[PDB]
């Protein structure tokens, strides 16, 4: 885990998530996908404590998929984010809390708008034009403050994202082995293979 | 009639019909005999089969190195009660380093059977047991009835046609009680006792079941070719 970013543009939400899985002084894997598709137009990236992350992501995934089958209907990104926040808000006062931070990128088909939600392990939800968890924010936020515009295209968003990854690769202490980038829009979720 | 729907109901003459019907299951069961001397205690049991293709239902169960019983009636109920005895014998060993007295074993079975005759929902045990054992006060023989009534005896028999063996032992009392330091003769007396309850059938090699416990003899069961000696 470590680096997860998110950028909402005019017509889509773009999530970038690091590929490295490190444990001790060894990088065990350099191709890890730190994300789960909750519904056809909703994607959740995650970072935090080992084990907790995937366990939480898949637990949410199962619940949203259960809802979809029961109602034959897709929950809005806002509705999914509120469900996720409540689960983390319960968790924080449990015997052993989920130590997982998430970004939820979704395309609301009723509003025809992209939506990006940042939720930390405490259950602190915020809707944002761009988001990051962990130390990534300490570089990317100031960079995006400068270069981000609300009316950008998906291609402009990817170039803006390349700028963030380049900055992180230059100044971050750890090698996070690049990122897997995914785009969420009106046509659903797809992965950029060459980044 | 109207007072046999459950065990919690008394009849107008003060009878518990469910307990009496449980007692009836014992009478249908195959005959088993118990007797003892001052040194050894012996169980003899007539086993019963479903047909010629089936095995013969085992009647005797070991409870500890120094104790065990024979059954007549519902076999699963004997398994429940024998398992309880195994635990109680075992509790006495682990906690107090003490072999459970055969008399206490009876008291425990009595109290377990009784609780099933005073509460709604439950049912009486449908089996009669003959417990033999050798403890610090010598050899013992007990007769358990699912009414709760436990009785210490020199000899006895329960099951179908048990009255024949019970009459024989009542005549033979003075003889077999003094068979001390002789296992084979005490068994012979028990095998002759159970023979008074036979009709049309005789004791064969896979039909007879004998058990013995005594002064220098752990509770052991004899079946198959090991009982051929006594036919």
């Amino acid at each position: 885990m470590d680096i997860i970013l998110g950028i909402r543009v005019q017509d889509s939400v773009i999530l970038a998530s690091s590929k490295a899985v490190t444990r001790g002084i060894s990088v065990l894997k350099d191709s890890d996908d730190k994300t789960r598709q909750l519904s056809p137009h909703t994607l959740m990236s995650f970072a935090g404590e080992a084990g907790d992350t995937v366990q939480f992501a898949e637990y949410i995934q199962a619940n949203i998929q259960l809802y979809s089958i029961r109602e034959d209907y897709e929950l809005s990104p806002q509705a999914v984010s509120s469900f996720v926040r409540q689960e983390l808000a319960k968790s924080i006062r449990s015997r052993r809390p989920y130590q997982v931070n998430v970004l939820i990128g979704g395309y609301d088909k009723k509003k025809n708008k992209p939506e990006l939600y940042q939720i930390d392990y405490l259950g602190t939800k915020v809707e944002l034009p761009y988001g990051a968890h962990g130390y990534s924010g300490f570089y990317t936020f100031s960079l995006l403050d400068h270069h981000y515009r609300p009316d950008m295209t998906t291609e402009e968003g990817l170039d803006l994202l390349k700028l963030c990854v380049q900055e992180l690769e230059k100044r971050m202490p750890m090698d996070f082995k690049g990122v897997i980038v995914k785009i969420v829009d009106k046509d659903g979720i797809r992965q950029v293979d060459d980044f | 009639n109207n007072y046999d729907g459950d065990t919690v109901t008394f009849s107008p003459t003060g009878r518990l019909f469910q307990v009496e019907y449980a007692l009836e299951a014992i009478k249908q069961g195959s005959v088993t005999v118990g007797l003892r001397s001052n040194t050894h205690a012996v169980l003899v049991a007539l086993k019963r089969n479903a047909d010629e293709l089936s095995s013969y239902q085992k009647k005797i169960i070991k409870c500890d190195e120094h104790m065990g019983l024979s059954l007549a009636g519902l076999a699963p109920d004997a398994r429940v009660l024998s398992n309880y005895l195994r635990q109680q014998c075992n509790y006495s060993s682990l906690v107090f380093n003490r072999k459970l007295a055969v008399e206490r074993a009876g008291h425990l079975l009595c109290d377990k059977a009784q609780k099933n005759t005073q509460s709604y929902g439950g049912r009486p045990y449908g089996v009669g047991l003959l417990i033999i054992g050798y403890d610090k006060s010598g050899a013992h023989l007990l007769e358990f009835q699912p009414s709760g009534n436990v009785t210490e005896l020199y000899g006895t028999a329960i099951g179908a046609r048990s009255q024949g063996a019970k009459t024989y032992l009542e005549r033979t009392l003075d003889t077999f009680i003094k068979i001390d330091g002789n296992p084979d003769e005490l068994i012979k007396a028990g095998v002759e006792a159970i023979s008074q309850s036979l009709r049309d059938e005789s004791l064969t090699v896979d039909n007879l079941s004998i058990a013995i416990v005594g002064k220098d003899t752990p509770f052991t069961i004899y079946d198959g070719e090991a009982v051929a000696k006594y036919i």
Partner: protein
């Protein structure tokens, strides 16, 4: 009404006796034990021709060394099988060995009387449990809802049981080969079955020390049916 765990005046549990009537309505199942193995066979009895008969699963594996056939309310057997499988695997976990066929049967029979006012009624299904272990060799057990089990050299349960059992009484001897037993199950099944016996409405299985428990293919059973018809015509 009346209590579920009530005794009759003859000293029998009403519900257990009534469950035995349900088993008599069930489809026929036959088991034969030899020194070369134990054979289990059942009547499938499809209620309609549109029903795909291969989905009728009345012979079942418990472990590699223990198999099981059923008769009566076959839905009731699912939890009995589940318990048997868990009991078998659990014993292997605790003791690093195969569990005795008798101990397995006893474990299944402990469920039987756990009913009253635990489950609400006895099981309405009888089981034929066949297996092998190193101590007592090839064994066949008949497990009832009374909590009682008998070891058998051969046994039939179900609607054609009393007619088949009388036939097994004459045919069984202590020197039967496995092949002889296979044919004997087919022969006796064909006698008591309503519809004409073939590979689709009857199923065979066996347990051997070497190859363990195996349900036969419809192709393999079909050849044994053809071999059986030829041998009866040959004298």
């Amino acid at each position: 009404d009346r209590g579920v765990s009530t005794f009759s005046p003859e000293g029998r549990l009403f519900q257990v006796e009534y469950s035995l009537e349900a088993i008599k309505l069930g489809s026929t199942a036959i088991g034969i034990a030899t020194k070369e193995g134990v054979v289990l066979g059942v009547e499938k009895r499809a209620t309609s021709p549109l029903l795909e008969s291969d989905s009728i699963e009345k012979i079942v594996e418990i472990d590699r060394h223990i198999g099981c056939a059923m008769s009566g309310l076959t839905a009731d057997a699912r939890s009995m099988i589940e318990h048997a499988r868990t009991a078998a695997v659990t014993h292997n976990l605790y003791y690093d060995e195969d569990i005795n066929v008798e101990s397995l049967t006893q474990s299944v029979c402990d469920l039987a009387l756990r009913f009253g006012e635990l489950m609400s009624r006895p099981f309405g299904v009888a089981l034929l449990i066949a297996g092998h272990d190193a101590d007592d060799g090839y064994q066949l057990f008949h497990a009832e809802p009374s909590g009682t089990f008998y070891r058998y050299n051969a046994k039939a349960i179900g609607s054609g049981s009393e007619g088949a059992q009388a036939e097994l009484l004459n045919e069984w001897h202590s020197s039967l080969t496995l092949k002889e037993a296979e044919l004997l199950v087919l022969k006796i099944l064909k006698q008591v079955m309503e519809e004409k016996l073939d590979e689709n409405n009857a199923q065979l299985s066996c347990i051997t020390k070497q190859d363990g428990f195996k349900i036969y293919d419809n192709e393999k059973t079909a050849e044994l049916i053809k071999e059986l018809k030829e041998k009866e015509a040959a004298e």
